[PDB]
Design a protein around this ligand. Structure first.
Ligand SMILES: C[S@@+](CC[C@H](N)C(=O)[O-])C[C@H]1O[C@@H](n2cnc3c(N)ncnc32)[C@H](O)[C@@H]1O
Ligand SMILES: C[S@@+](CC[C@H](N)C(=O)[O-])C[C@H]1O[C@@H](n2cnc3c(N)ncnc32)[C@H](O)[C@@H]1O
Ligand SMILES: C=Cc1ccc(O)cc1
Lengths: 284, 283
Protein backbone atom coordinates (compact mmCIF):
# COMPACT_ATOMS: atom_id res chain seq x y z
CA UNK A 1 0.00 0.00 0.00
CA UNK A 2 0.88 3.72 -0.08
CA UNK A 3 4.19 3.83 -1.96
CA UNK A 4 3.35 1.21 -4.59
CA UNK A 5 1.36 -1.78 -3.36
CA UNK A 6 2.38 -5.24 -2.16
CA UNK A 7 5.97 -5.79 -3.21
CA UNK A 8 7.59 -9.23 -2.93
CA UNK A 9 5.01 -11.09 -5.06
CA UNK A 10 6.77 -14.41 -4.41
CA UNK A 11 5.58 -14.45 -0.79
CA UNK A 12 2.00 -13.66 -1.84
CA UNK A 13 1.47 -16.65 -4.16
CA UNK A 14 1.91 -18.78 -1.04
CA UNK A 15 -1.77 -17.97 -0.47
CA UNK A 16 -2.80 -18.66 -4.08
CA UNK A 17 -3.76 -22.30 -3.41
CA UNK A 18 -6.20 -20.92 -0.80
CA UNK A 19 -7.22 -17.44 -1.99
CA UNK A 20 -7.97 -18.93 -5.42
CA UNK A 21 -10.60 -21.24 -3.94
CA UNK A 22 -12.08 -18.44 -1.82
CA UNK A 23 -12.86 -16.03 -4.65
CA UNK A 24 -13.80 -19.00 -6.83
CA UNK A 25 -16.53 -19.69 -4.27
CA UNK A 26 -17.65 -16.06 -4.03
CA UNK A 27 -17.95 -15.68 -7.80
CA UNK A 28 -19.95 -18.91 -8.13
CA UNK A 29 -22.65 -17.41 -5.90
CA UNK A 30 -22.94 -14.30 -8.08
CA UNK A 31 -22.11 -15.60 -11.56
CA UNK A 32 -25.73 -16.45 -12.37
CA UNK A 33 -26.74 -12.84 -11.63
CA UNK A 34 -24.21 -11.48 -14.16
CA UNK A 35 -25.59 -10.42 -17.54
CA UNK A 36 -23.34 -10.23 -20.58
CA UNK A 37 -23.48 -8.49 -23.97
CA UNK A 38 -23.73 -10.30 -27.29
CA UNK A 39 -20.45 -9.02 -28.70
CA UNK A 40 -18.01 -9.36 -25.77
CA UNK A 41 -16.46 -6.31 -24.12
CA UNK A 42 -13.14 -6.08 -22.27
CA UNK A 43 -13.30 -7.03 -18.59
CA UNK A 44 -11.14 -5.29 -15.98
CA UNK A 45 -9.63 -6.66 -12.76
CA UNK A 46 -8.42 -4.01 -10.31
CA UNK A 47 -5.82 -4.97 -7.72
CA UNK A 48 -5.19 -8.32 -9.39
CA UNK A 49 -2.16 -9.14 -7.25
CA UNK A 50 0.08 -11.86 -8.70
CA UNK A 51 -2.60 -12.56 -11.29
CA UNK A 52 -4.04 -15.78 -9.89
CA UNK A 53 -7.68 -14.73 -9.55
CA UNK A 54 -7.29 -13.19 -13.01
CA UNK A 55 -5.87 -16.35 -14.61
CA UNK A 56 -7.24 -19.31 -12.64
CA UNK A 57 -10.68 -17.95 -11.66
CA UNK A 58 -11.87 -15.07 -13.83
CA UNK A 59 -10.50 -16.20 -17.20
CA UNK A 60 -12.00 -19.75 -17.17
CA UNK A 61 -15.43 -18.31 -16.28
CA UNK A 62 -15.66 -15.47 -18.82
CA UNK A 63 -17.56 -15.94 -22.09
CA UNK A 64 -15.58 -16.96 -25.14
CA UNK A 65 -13.71 -14.12 -26.83
CA UNK A 66 -13.83 -11.91 -23.73
CA UNK A 67 -10.52 -10.11 -23.29
CA UNK A 68 -9.30 -9.50 -19.74
CA UNK A 69 -7.29 -6.55 -18.39
CA UNK A 70 -5.67 -6.88 -14.96
CA UNK A 71 -4.04 -3.95 -13.16
CA UNK A 72 -2.16 -3.44 -9.90
CA UNK A 73 -0.41 -0.39 -8.47
CA UNK A 74 2.58 -2.54 -7.50
CA UNK A 75 4.95 -3.19 -10.45
CA UNK A 76 6.54 -6.32 -8.94
CA UNK A 77 3.08 -7.91 -9.02
CA UNK A 78 2.38 -7.04 -12.66
CA UNK A 79 5.77 -8.41 -13.74
CA UNK A 80 5.11 -11.58 -11.75
CA UNK A 81 1.83 -11.90 -13.67
CA UNK A 82 3.28 -11.42 -17.17
CA UNK A 83 5.86 -14.14 -16.38
CA UNK A 84 3.92 -16.90 -14.58
CA UNK A 85 0.14 -16.49 -14.88
CA UNK A 86 0.61 -14.93 -18.32
CA UNK A 87 -2.33 -15.97 -20.50
CA UNK A 88 -1.81 -14.83 -24.11
CA UNK A 89 -4.69 -13.60 -26.22
CA UNK A 90 -6.91 -13.10 -23.17
CA UNK A 91 -5.30 -11.45 -20.13
CA UNK A 92 -3.24 -8.26 -20.50
CA UNK A 93 -1.53 -7.41 -17.21
CA UNK A 94 -0.96 -3.67 -16.78
CA UNK A 95 -0.10 -1.05 -14.17
CA UNK A 96 -2.68 1.31 -12.69
CA UNK A 97 -3.55 3.10 -9.46
CA UNK A 98 -7.31 2.91 -8.88
CA UNK A 99 -7.29 6.47 -7.50
CA UNK A 100 -5.14 7.92 -10.27
CA UNK A 101 -5.36 11.73 -10.65
CA UNK A 102 -5.09 11.54 -14.46
CA UNK A 103 -6.89 8.30 -15.26
CA UNK A 104 -7.38 9.31 -18.90
CA UNK A 105 -3.60 9.20 -19.49
CA UNK A 106 -3.17 5.51 -18.60
CA UNK A 107 -3.08 2.45 -20.84
CA UNK A 108 -5.97 0.82 -18.95
CA UNK A 109 -8.34 3.72 -19.64
CA UNK A 110 -7.75 3.53 -23.40
CA UNK A 111 -8.31 -0.23 -23.43
CA UNK A 112 -11.83 0.59 -22.23
CA UNK A 113 -14.68 1.08 -21.88
CA UNK A 114 -15.23 -2.11 -19.86
CA UNK A 115 -18.34 -4.24 -19.52
CA UNK A 116 -17.48 -5.70 -16.11
CA UNK A 117 -14.96 -4.64 -13.47
CA UNK A 118 -13.92 -7.04 -10.70
CA UNK A 119 -12.43 -5.29 -7.65
CA UNK A 120 -11.49 -8.00 -5.15
CA UNK A 121 -9.69 -7.81 -1.80
CA UNK A 122 -8.01 -4.46 -2.50
CA UNK A 123 -10.47 -1.64 -1.67
CA UNK A 124 -9.32 -1.77 1.97
CA UNK A 125 -5.85 -0.70 0.77
CA UNK A 126 -7.48 2.46 -0.66
CA UNK A 127 -8.07 5.25 1.89
CA UNK A 128 -10.24 7.27 -0.54
CA UNK A 129 -13.00 4.80 -1.39
CA UNK A 130 -15.35 7.27 -3.09
CA UNK A 131 -12.62 8.38 -5.50
CA UNK A 132 -12.03 4.73 -6.40
CA UNK A 133 -15.75 4.11 -6.98
CA UNK A 134 -15.80 7.21 -9.21
CA UNK A 135 -12.94 6.00 -11.41
CA UNK A 136 -14.60 2.58 -11.65
CA UNK A 137 -17.79 4.41 -12.66
CA UNK A 138 -15.87 6.17 -15.44
CA UNK A 139 -14.49 2.86 -16.74
CA UNK A 140 -17.86 1.07 -17.01
CA UNK A 141 -20.24 1.23 -19.96
CA UNK A 142 -23.76 2.34 -18.96
CA UNK A 143 -25.32 -0.88 -17.71
CA UNK A 144 -21.97 -2.47 -16.89
CA UNK A 145 -21.56 -4.27 -13.59
CA UNK A 146 -18.98 -4.07 -10.81
CA UNK A 147 -18.12 -6.88 -8.38
CA UNK A 148 -16.67 -5.81 -5.02
CA UNK A 149 -14.94 -8.02 -2.44
CA UNK A 150 -14.23 -5.38 0.22
CA UNK A 151 -12.75 -6.38 3.57
CA UNK A 152 -14.92 -4.68 6.19
CA UNK A 153 -12.79 -5.28 9.28
CA UNK A 154 -9.99 -7.57 10.42
CA UNK A 155 -7.55 -7.93 13.30
CA UNK A 156 -4.65 -6.85 11.07
CA UNK A 157 -6.06 -3.31 11.12
CA UNK A 158 -6.38 -3.12 14.91
CA UNK A 159 -2.86 -4.51 15.30
CA UNK A 160 -1.77 -1.54 13.19
CA UNK A 161 -3.58 0.97 15.41
CA UNK A 162 -2.15 -0.57 18.59
CA UNK A 163 1.41 -0.50 17.25
CA UNK A 164 0.94 3.13 16.19
CA UNK A 165 0.84 4.12 19.88
CA UNK A 166 4.32 2.71 20.58
CA UNK A 167 6.89 5.55 20.69
CA UNK A 168 9.24 2.86 19.38
CA UNK A 169 7.30 3.03 16.10
CA UNK A 170 4.88 6.01 16.03
CA UNK A 171 7.14 8.13 13.81
CA UNK A 172 6.60 5.77 10.86
CA UNK A 173 2.91 5.27 11.71
CA UNK A 174 1.65 8.87 11.87
CA UNK A 175 -0.81 8.02 9.08
CA UNK A 176 -2.16 4.80 10.60
CA UNK A 177 -5.79 5.58 9.72
CA UNK A 178 -4.85 5.64 6.02
CA UNK A 179 -3.47 2.10 6.36
CA UNK A 180 -6.74 0.87 7.91
CA UNK A 181 -9.90 -0.12 6.05
CA UNK A 182 -12.45 2.74 6.19
CA UNK A 183 -15.13 0.23 7.22
CA UNK A 184 -13.04 -1.02 10.16
CA UNK A 185 -14.84 0.94 12.90
CA UNK A 186 -18.11 1.16 10.95
CA UNK A 187 -21.15 0.00 12.91
CA UNK A 188 -22.89 -1.04 9.67
CA UNK A 189 -20.45 -1.80 6.83
CA UNK A 190 -23.03 -3.13 4.36
CA UNK A 191 -25.14 0.00 4.78
CA UNK A 192 -22.27 2.45 4.29
CA UNK A 193 -20.97 0.58 1.24
CA UNK A 194 -24.46 0.32 -0.26
CA UNK A 195 -24.88 4.06 0.35
CA UNK A 196 -21.48 4.86 -1.18
CA UNK A 197 -22.15 2.90 -4.38
CA UNK A 198 -25.62 4.40 -4.86
CA UNK A 199 -24.16 7.86 -4.17
CA UNK A 200 -22.04 7.41 -7.33
CA UNK A 201 -24.75 6.33 -9.78
CA UNK A 202 -24.76 2.58 -9.10
CA UNK A 203 -27.61 0.10 -8.64
CA UNK A 204 -26.64 -2.14 -5.72
CA UNK A 205 -28.08 -5.51 -6.75
CA UNK A 206 -26.66 -7.53 -3.84
CA UNK A 207 -24.55 -6.70 -0.78
CA UNK A 208 -23.72 -9.10 2.06
CA UNK A 209 -21.13 -9.49 4.82
CA UNK A 210 -19.58 -12.70 6.10
CA UNK A 211 -16.47 -14.14 7.74
CA UNK A 212 -13.68 -15.84 5.82
CA UNK A 213 -10.70 -18.06 6.60
CA UNK A 214 -7.44 -18.26 4.64
CA UNK A 215 -5.96 -21.76 4.86
CA UNK A 216 -2.23 -22.50 4.96
CA UNK A 217 -0.95 -26.10 5.12
CA UNK A 218 2.46 -25.37 6.65
CA UNK A 219 3.58 -23.15 9.51
CA UNK A 220 6.05 -20.92 7.67
CA UNK A 221 3.85 -20.24 4.63
CA UNK A 222 1.39 -18.85 7.17
CA UNK A 223 4.24 -16.65 8.43
CA UNK A 224 5.83 -15.83 5.06
CA UNK A 225 2.46 -14.79 3.61
CA UNK A 226 1.92 -12.32 6.46
CA UNK A 227 5.28 -10.74 5.57
CA UNK A 228 3.85 -9.66 2.22
CA UNK A 229 0.54 -8.19 3.41
CA UNK A 230 2.34 -6.13 6.07
CA UNK A 231 1.97 -2.63 4.63
CA UNK A 232 4.40 -0.83 6.97
CA UNK A 233 7.53 -2.96 6.45
CA UNK A 234 8.73 -0.85 3.51
CA UNK A 235 9.22 2.12 5.88
CA UNK A 236 11.19 0.31 8.61
CA UNK A 237 15.00 -0.05 8.46
CA UNK A 238 16.49 -3.52 8.58
CA UNK A 239 17.55 -3.56 12.24
CA UNK A 240 13.87 -3.13 13.19
CA UNK A 241 12.14 -4.85 10.24
CA UNK A 242 12.26 -8.29 11.88
CA UNK A 243 11.13 -6.57 15.10
CA UNK A 244 8.15 -4.82 13.51
CA UNK A 245 7.06 -8.24 12.23
CA UNK A 246 7.27 -10.10 15.55
CA UNK A 247 5.60 -7.16 17.28
CA UNK A 248 2.89 -7.42 14.62
CA UNK A 249 2.48 -11.21 14.68
CA UNK A 250 2.30 -11.30 18.49
CA UNK A 251 -0.45 -8.66 18.49
CA UNK A 252 -2.39 -10.81 16.00
CA UNK A 253 -3.07 -13.90 18.12
CA UNK A 254 -3.83 -11.44 20.91
CA UNK A 255 -6.58 -10.01 18.68
CA UNK A 256 -7.26 -13.56 17.38
CA UNK A 257 -7.08 -12.70 13.69
CA UNK A 258 -4.84 -15.69 13.05
CA UNK A 259 -5.40 -19.17 14.45
CA UNK A 260 -4.12 -22.74 14.31
CA UNK A 261 -6.20 -25.90 14.08
CA UNK A 262 -6.08 -29.66 13.52
CA UNK A 263 -6.79 -31.75 10.45
CA UNK A 264 -8.67 -34.97 9.74
CA UNK A 265 -5.30 -36.53 8.85
CA UNK A 266 -3.90 -35.05 12.08
CA UNK A 267 -1.74 -32.38 10.44
CA UNK A 268 -1.58 -28.79 11.67
CA UNK A 269 -3.81 -26.20 9.99
CA UNK A 270 -3.17 -22.45 9.96
CA UNK A 271 -5.76 -19.75 9.31
CA UNK A 272 -6.33 -16.03 8.86
CA UNK A 273 -9.71 -14.60 9.86
CA UNK A 274 -11.39 -11.51 8.40
CA UNK A 275 -14.79 -10.13 7.33
CA UNK A 276 -15.64 -9.62 3.65
CA UNK A 277 -18.30 -7.44 2.05
CA UNK A 278 -19.44 -8.90 -1.28
CA UNK A 279 -21.19 -6.52 -3.66
CA UNK A 280 -22.73 -6.46 -7.14
CA UNK A 281 -23.48 -3.07 -8.71
CA UNK A 282 -24.46 -1.68 -12.10
CA UNK A 283 -23.85 1.70 -13.75
CA UNK A 284 -26.80 3.74 -14.99
CA UNK B 1 2.70 -51.05 0.10
CA UNK B 2 2.01 -47.86 -1.88
CA UNK B 3 -1.25 -46.34 -0.67
CA UNK B 4 -0.59 -43.39 -2.94
CA UNK B 5 0.72 -40.11 -1.56
CA UNK B 6 0.08 -39.45 2.12
CA UNK B 7 0.74 -36.08 3.79
CA UNK B 8 -1.69 -34.11 1.58
CA UNK B 9 -0.73 -30.89 3.38
CA UNK B 10 2.68 -30.94 1.70
CA UNK B 11 1.33 -31.65 -1.79
CA UNK B 12 -0.93 -28.59 -2.01
CA UNK B 13 2.28 -26.53 -1.91
CA UNK B 14 2.47 -27.38 -5.62
CA UNK B 15 -1.17 -26.52 -6.32
CA UNK B 16 -0.45 -22.83 -7.01
CA UNK B 17 1.82 -24.11 -9.84
CA UNK B 18 0.35 -27.47 -10.90
CA UNK B 19 -3.07 -25.82 -11.27
CA UNK B 20 -1.73 -23.44 -13.92
CA UNK B 21 0.15 -26.24 -15.70
CA UNK B 22 -2.77 -28.64 -16.14
CA UNK B 23 -4.97 -25.65 -16.97
CA UNK B 24 -2.57 -24.86 -19.82
CA UNK B 25 -2.54 -28.45 -21.11
CA UNK B 26 -6.34 -28.66 -21.23
CA UNK B 27 -6.61 -25.36 -23.11
CA UNK B 28 -4.48 -26.90 -25.86
CA UNK B 29 -6.91 -29.85 -26.14
CA UNK B 30 -10.30 -28.45 -25.09
CA UNK B 31 -11.21 -27.51 -28.68
CA UNK B 32 -10.90 -31.16 -29.79
CA UNK B 33 -13.30 -32.44 -27.10
CA UNK B 34 -16.79 -33.41 -28.25
CA UNK B 35 -19.62 -33.47 -25.73
CA UNK B 36 -22.96 -35.32 -25.66
CA UNK B 37 -26.32 -33.58 -25.65
CA UNK B 38 -27.34 -34.97 -22.26
CA UNK B 39 -24.36 -34.68 -19.88
CA UNK B 40 -22.60 -37.84 -18.70
CA UNK B 41 -20.46 -38.16 -15.56
CA UNK B 42 -16.79 -37.22 -15.92
CA UNK B 43 -14.08 -39.07 -14.00
CA UNK B 44 -10.72 -37.77 -12.74
CA UNK B 45 -8.50 -40.67 -11.67
CA UNK B 46 -5.63 -39.97 -9.29
CA UNK B 47 -6.99 -36.51 -8.53
CA UNK B 48 -4.70 -35.73 -5.60
CA UNK B 49 -5.95 -33.07 -3.18
CA UNK B 50 -8.85 -32.25 -5.50
CA UNK B 51 -7.14 -29.18 -6.95
CA UNK B 52 -7.11 -30.13 -10.65
CA UNK B 53 -10.82 -30.88 -10.24
CA UNK B 54 -12.42 -28.03 -8.29
CA UNK B 55 -10.28 -25.29 -9.85
CA UNK B 56 -9.36 -26.72 -13.29
CA UNK B 57 -11.88 -29.34 -14.46
CA UNK B 58 -15.26 -28.36 -13.00
CA UNK B 59 -15.11 -24.63 -13.94
CA UNK B 60 -14.90 -25.41 -17.68
CA UNK B 61 -17.29 -28.32 -17.66
CA UNK B 62 -20.58 -28.35 -19.59
CA UNK B 63 -23.22 -27.09 -17.16
CA UNK B 64 -25.15 -30.04 -15.77
CA UNK B 65 -22.19 -32.42 -15.95
CA UNK B 66 -21.16 -34.11 -12.70
CA UNK B 67 -17.54 -34.85 -11.81
CA UNK B 68 -16.22 -37.90 -9.96
CA UNK B 69 -12.66 -37.66 -8.63
CA UNK B 70 -10.89 -40.66 -7.12
CA UNK B 71 -7.50 -41.24 -5.53
CA UNK B 72 -6.00 -44.39 -4.05
CA UNK B 73 -4.99 -42.79 -0.72
CA UNK B 74 -7.62 -41.91 1.91
CA UNK B 75 -5.58 -38.90 3.04
CA UNK B 76 -6.04 -37.23 -0.34
CA UNK B 77 -9.65 -38.41 -0.62
CA UNK B 78 -10.08 -36.89 2.86
CA UNK B 79 -8.27 -33.65 2.01
CA UNK B 80 -10.59 -33.10 -0.96
CA UNK B 81 -13.90 -33.62 0.86
CA UNK B 82 -12.80 -30.96 3.37
CA UNK B 83 -11.08 -28.20 1.37
CA UNK B 84 -11.70 -28.47 -2.38
CA UNK B 85 -15.21 -29.87 -1.79
CA UNK B 86 -17.67 -28.73 -4.47
CA UNK B 87 -21.17 -30.02 -3.63
CA UNK B 88 -23.66 -30.96 -6.31
CA UNK B 89 -20.82 -31.44 -8.80
CA UNK B 90 -17.60 -33.13 -7.68
CA UNK B 91 -17.76 -36.36 -5.68
CA UNK B 92 -14.49 -37.59 -4.15
CA UNK B 93 -14.25 -41.38 -3.77
CA UNK B 94 -11.43 -43.89 -3.32
CA UNK B 95 -10.21 -46.09 -6.16
CA UNK B 96 -7.10 -47.95 -7.32
CA UNK B 97 -6.84 -47.67 -11.10
CA UNK B 98 -5.56 -51.26 -11.27
CA UNK B 99 -8.23 -52.65 -8.95
CA UNK B 100 -8.79 -56.41 -9.41
CA UNK B 101 -12.54 -56.00 -8.81
CA UNK B 102 -13.44 -52.72 -10.48
CA UNK B 103 -17.14 -53.61 -10.65
CA UNK B 104 -17.39 -53.72 -6.83
CA UNK B 105 -16.31 -50.07 -6.43
CA UNK B 106 -18.44 -46.96 -6.03
CA UNK B 107 -16.68 -45.27 -8.96
CA UNK B 108 -17.72 -48.07 -11.32
CA UNK B 109 -21.41 -47.56 -10.56
CA UNK B 110 -21.45 -43.79 -10.88
CA UNK B 111 -20.54 -44.59 -14.48
CA UNK B 112 -20.38 -45.20 -17.34
CA UNK B 113 -18.35 -42.00 -17.80
CA UNK B 114 -18.33 -39.76 -20.85
CA UNK B 115 -14.77 -38.49 -20.35
CA UNK B 116 -11.93 -39.64 -18.09
CA UNK B 117 -9.05 -37.36 -17.12
CA UNK B 118 -5.71 -38.78 -15.96
CA UNK B 119 -3.02 -36.28 -14.94
CA UNK B 120 0.44 -37.20 -13.61
CA UNK B 121 -0.29 -40.57 -12.05
CA UNK B 122 0.30 -43.38 -14.58
CA UNK B 123 4.01 -43.13 -13.71
CA UNK B 124 3.03 -44.46 -10.24
CA UNK B 125 1.13 -47.42 -11.77
CA UNK B 126 3.54 -50.23 -12.80
CA UNK B 127 0.96 -52.25 -14.77
CA UNK B 128 -0.01 -49.57 -17.28
CA UNK B 129 -1.88 -51.85 -19.69
CA UNK B 130 -4.12 -53.01 -16.83
CA UNK B 131 -4.91 -49.39 -15.93
CA UNK B 132 -5.70 -48.56 -19.57
CA UNK B 133 -8.02 -51.57 -19.80
CA UNK B 134 -9.84 -50.39 -16.66
CA UNK B 135 -10.17 -46.90 -18.13
CA UNK B 136 -11.54 -48.53 -21.29
CA UNK B 137 -14.20 -50.29 -19.19
CA UNK B 138 -15.25 -47.02 -17.54
CA UNK B 139 -15.75 -45.13 -20.82
CA UNK B 140 -18.84 -45.14 -23.02
CA UNK B 141 -18.25 -46.12 -26.68
CA UNK B 142 -17.17 -42.81 -28.16
CA UNK B 143 -15.90 -41.36 -24.89
CA UNK B 144 -12.52 -39.68 -24.64
CA UNK B 145 -9.57 -40.10 -22.27
CA UNK B 146 -7.11 -37.28 -21.55
CA UNK B 147 -3.75 -38.60 -20.36
CA UNK B 148 -0.86 -36.69 -18.76
CA UNK B 149 1.83 -39.32 -18.21
CA UNK B 150 5.35 -38.47 -17.07
CA UNK B 151 7.71 -40.22 -19.49
CA UNK B 152 11.00 -39.73 -17.62
CA UNK B 153 12.26 -37.57 -14.77
CA UNK B 154 15.35 -37.33 -12.60
CA UNK B 155 13.38 -38.30 -9.48
CA UNK B 156 13.39 -41.83 -10.92
CA UNK B 157 17.09 -41.97 -11.80
CA UNK B 158 17.85 -40.81 -8.25
CA UNK B 159 15.76 -43.76 -7.05
CA UNK B 160 17.70 -46.28 -9.13
CA UNK B 161 21.02 -44.88 -7.91
CA UNK B 162 19.95 -45.06 -4.26
CA UNK B 163 18.84 -48.67 -4.73
CA UNK B 164 22.47 -49.69 -5.34
CA UNK B 165 23.49 -48.43 -1.89
CA UNK B 166 23.74 -51.28 0.66
CA UNK B 167 22.58 -48.58 3.08
CA UNK B 168 19.13 -48.80 1.44
CA UNK B 169 19.07 -51.92 -0.75
CA UNK B 170 16.79 -53.82 1.64
CA UNK B 171 14.03 -51.22 1.22
CA UNK B 172 14.59 -50.68 -2.52
CA UNK B 173 14.59 -54.23 -3.90
CA UNK B 174 11.58 -53.35 -6.10
CA UNK B 175 13.02 -50.12 -7.47
CA UNK B 176 11.80 -50.79 -11.02
CA UNK B 177 8.21 -50.69 -9.71
CA UNK B 178 8.79 -47.18 -8.28
CA UNK B 179 9.97 -45.86 -11.67
CA UNK B 180 7.90 -44.80 -14.66
CA UNK B 181 7.89 -47.56 -17.31
CA UNK B 182 8.67 -45.00 -20.03
CA UNK B 183 11.75 -43.86 -18.09
CA UNK B 184 14.18 -45.87 -20.25
CA UNK B 185 11.96 -45.73 -23.35
CA UNK B 186 13.77 -44.51 -26.46
CA UNK B 187 10.38 -43.43 -27.88
CA UNK B 188 7.78 -42.79 -25.15
CA UNK B 189 5.21 -41.32 -27.55
CA UNK B 190 5.37 -44.41 -29.75
CA UNK B 191 5.00 -46.93 -26.93
CA UNK B 192 2.10 -45.04 -25.36
CA UNK B 193 0.28 -44.62 -28.67
CA UNK B 194 0.75 -48.34 -29.31
CA UNK B 195 -0.43 -49.16 -25.78
CA UNK B 196 -3.63 -47.14 -26.16
CA UNK B 197 -4.46 -48.52 -29.61
CA UNK B 198 -3.78 -52.09 -28.41
CA UNK B 199 -6.71 -51.59 -25.99
CA UNK B 200 -9.29 -50.31 -28.49
CA UNK B 201 -8.48 -46.59 -28.34
CA UNK B 202 -8.17 -44.07 -31.17
CA UNK B 203 -5.15 -41.89 -30.36
CA UNK B 204 -6.30 -38.48 -31.59
CA UNK B 205 -3.19 -36.58 -30.46
CA UNK B 206 0.04 -37.43 -28.64
CA UNK B 207 3.04 -35.22 -27.87
CA UNK B 208 6.04 -35.12 -25.54
CA UNK B 209 7.39 -31.96 -23.96
CA UNK B 210 9.36 -30.74 -20.96
CA UNK B 211 7.48 -29.02 -18.15
CA UNK B 212 8.44 -26.99 -15.09
CA UNK B 213 6.92 -26.77 -11.60
CA UNK B 214 7.69 -23.45 -9.91
CA UNK B 215 7.88 -22.74 -6.18
CA UNK B 216 8.36 -19.19 -4.86
CA UNK B 217 10.14 -20.03 -1.59
CA UNK B 218 12.95 -22.43 -0.76
CA UNK B 219 11.08 -24.65 1.69
CA UNK B 220 7.89 -25.08 -0.35
CA UNK B 221 10.22 -26.46 -3.01
CA UNK B 222 11.66 -28.75 -0.32
CA UNK B 223 8.46 -29.65 1.56
CA UNK B 224 6.77 -30.59 -1.72
CA UNK B 225 9.51 -33.09 -2.59
CA UNK B 226 8.89 -34.71 0.80
CA UNK B 227 5.41 -35.72 -0.38
CA UNK B 228 6.37 -37.03 -3.83
CA UNK B 229 9.06 -39.25 -2.29
CA UNK B 230 7.60 -42.73 -2.66
CA UNK B 231 10.11 -44.55 -0.42
CA UNK B 232 9.79 -42.53 2.80
CA UNK B 233 6.95 -44.69 4.16
CA UNK B 234 9.32 -47.68 4.27
CA UNK B 235 12.19 -45.97 6.13
CA UNK B 236 12.28 -45.77 9.94
CA UNK B 237 12.50 -42.32 11.51
CA UNK B 238 16.21 -42.57 12.34
CA UNK B 239 17.00 -42.82 8.61
CA UNK B 240 14.09 -40.79 7.19
CA UNK B 241 15.86 -37.43 7.37
CA UNK B 242 19.02 -39.08 6.04
CA UNK B 243 17.08 -40.68 3.18
CA UNK B 244 15.65 -37.30 2.14
CA UNK B 245 19.04 -35.54 2.08
CA UNK B 246 20.52 -38.45 0.13
CA UNK B 247 17.62 -38.11 -2.31
CA UNK B 248 17.76 -34.31 -2.56
CA UNK B 249 21.53 -34.20 -3.09
CA UNK B 250 21.34 -36.69 -5.97
CA UNK B 251 18.61 -34.60 -7.61
CA UNK B 252 20.79 -31.57 -8.37
CA UNK B 253 23.46 -34.07 -9.44
CA UNK B 254 21.08 -35.40 -12.11
CA UNK B 255 19.80 -31.83 -12.64
CA UNK B 256 16.12 -32.61 -12.20
CA UNK B 257 15.68 -29.74 -9.75
CA UNK B 258 17.03 -26.27 -10.53
CA UNK B 259 16.92 -22.74 -9.16
CA UNK B 260 16.48 -19.41 -10.93
CA UNK B 261 16.23 -15.64 -10.52
CA UNK B 262 13.24 -13.34 -10.73
CA UNK B 263 12.65 -10.05 -12.54
CA UNK B 264 12.02 -8.47 -9.12
CA UNK B 265 15.20 -10.12 -7.82
CA UNK B 266 13.62 -12.97 -5.86
CA UNK B 267 14.70 -16.61 -5.96
CA UNK B 268 12.85 -19.12 -8.14
CA UNK B 269 12.83 -22.89 -7.56
CA UNK B 270 11.95 -25.45 -10.22
CA UNK B 271 11.37 -29.15 -10.89
CA UNK B 272 11.97 -30.49 -14.41
CA UNK B 273 10.33 -33.53 -16.01
CA UNK B 274 8.98 -34.76 -19.35
CA UNK B 275 5.24 -35.16 -19.98
CA UNK B 276 3.32 -37.21 -22.54
CA UNK B 277 -0.02 -35.61 -23.42
CA UNK B 278 -2.60 -37.85 -25.08
CA UNK B 279 -6.20 -37.63 -26.29
CA UNK B 280 -7.80 -41.00 -27.06
CA UNK B 281 -11.28 -42.32 -27.82
CA UNK B 282 -13.02 -45.62 -27.12
CA UNK B 283 -14.49 -47.52 -30.07
C1 LIG C 1 -3.89 -8.00 -0.74
S1 LIG C 1 -3.99 -7.83 -2.53
C2 LIG C 1 -5.38 -8.86 -3.17
C3 LIG C 1 -5.12 -9.24 -4.65
C4 LIG C 1 -6.31 -10.04 -5.24
N1 LIG C 1 -7.57 -9.44 -4.82
C5 LIG C 1 -6.24 -11.49 -4.79
O1 LIG C 1 -6.96 -11.88 -3.84
O2 LIG C 1 -5.45 -12.31 -5.38
C6 LIG C 1 -4.31 -6.10 -2.95
C7 LIG C 1 -3.69 -5.78 -4.33
O3 LIG C 1 -4.14 -4.63 -4.76
C8 LIG C 1 -2.87 -3.68 -5.03
N2 LIG C 1 -3.18 -2.31 -4.67
C9 LIG C 1 -3.07 -1.79 -3.45
N3 LIG C 1 -3.44 -0.51 -3.47
C10 LIG C 1 -3.80 -0.20 -4.74
C11 LIG C 1 -4.27 0.97 -5.35
N4 LIG C 1 -4.46 2.23 -4.56
N5 LIG C 1 -4.53 0.93 -6.65
C12 LIG C 1 -4.37 -0.19 -7.37
N6 LIG C 1 -3.93 -1.31 -6.82
C13 LIG C 1 -3.64 -1.35 -5.51
C14 LIG C 1 -1.87 -4.15 -4.26
O4 LIG C 1 -0.55 -3.89 -4.90
C15 LIG C 1 -2.13 -5.64 -4.19
O5 LIG C 1 -1.50 -6.27 -5.22
C1 LIG D 1 1.05 -36.79 -7.62
S1 LIG D 1 -0.71 -36.99 -7.91
C2 LIG D 1 -1.22 -35.89 -9.29
C3 LIG D 1 -2.69 -35.47 -9.06
C4 LIG D 1 -3.12 -34.41 -10.10
N1 LIG D 1 -2.87 -34.90 -11.44
C5 LIG D 1 -2.38 -33.11 -9.86
O1 LIG D 1 -1.45 -32.77 -10.64
O2 LIG D 1 -2.69 -32.36 -8.87
C6 LIG D 1 -1.00 -38.71 -8.37
C7 LIG D 1 -2.13 -39.23 -7.46
O3 LIG D 1 -2.54 -40.38 -7.92
C8 LIG D 1 -2.60 -41.39 -6.68
N2 LIG D 1 -2.26 -42.72 -7.16
C9 LIG D 1 -1.05 -43.27 -7.16
N3 LIG D 1 -1.13 -44.49 -7.69
C10 LIG D 1 -2.41 -44.72 -8.04
C11 LIG D 1 -3.09 -45.80 -8.63
N4 LIG D 1 -2.35 -47.06 -9.01
N5 LIG D 1 -4.38 -45.68 -8.84
C12 LIG D 1 -5.06 -44.57 -8.51
N6 LIG D 1 -4.45 -43.54 -7.95
C13 LIG D 1 -3.14 -43.58 -7.71
C14 LIG D 1 -1.72 -40.95 -5.75
O4 LIG D 1 -2.28 -41.17 -4.38
C15 LIG D 1 -1.58 -39.47 -6.00
O5 LIG D 1 -2.32 -38.77 -5.10
C1 LIG E 1 5.84 -40.58 -6.10
C2 LIG E 1 6.45 -40.13 -7.17
C3 LIG E 1 5.89 -38.90 -7.90
C4 LIG E 1 6.46 -38.45 -9.08
C5 LIG E 1 5.95 -37.34 -9.73
C6 LIG E 1 4.86 -36.67 -9.20
O1 LIG E 1 4.32 -35.55 -9.84
C7 LIG E 1 4.29 -37.12 -8.02
C8 LIG E 1 4.80 -38.24 -7.37
Amino acid sequence: EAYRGIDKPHLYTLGCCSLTAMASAQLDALWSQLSWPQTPLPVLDIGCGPGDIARKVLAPRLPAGTRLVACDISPEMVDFCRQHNALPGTITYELLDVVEPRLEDTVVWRNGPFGKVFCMLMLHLVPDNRLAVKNIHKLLVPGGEAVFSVIANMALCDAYEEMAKEPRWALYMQDVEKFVSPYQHSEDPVGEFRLLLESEGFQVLRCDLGPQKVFFPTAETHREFLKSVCAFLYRIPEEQKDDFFDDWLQRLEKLKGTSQGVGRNGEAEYYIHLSVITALARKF
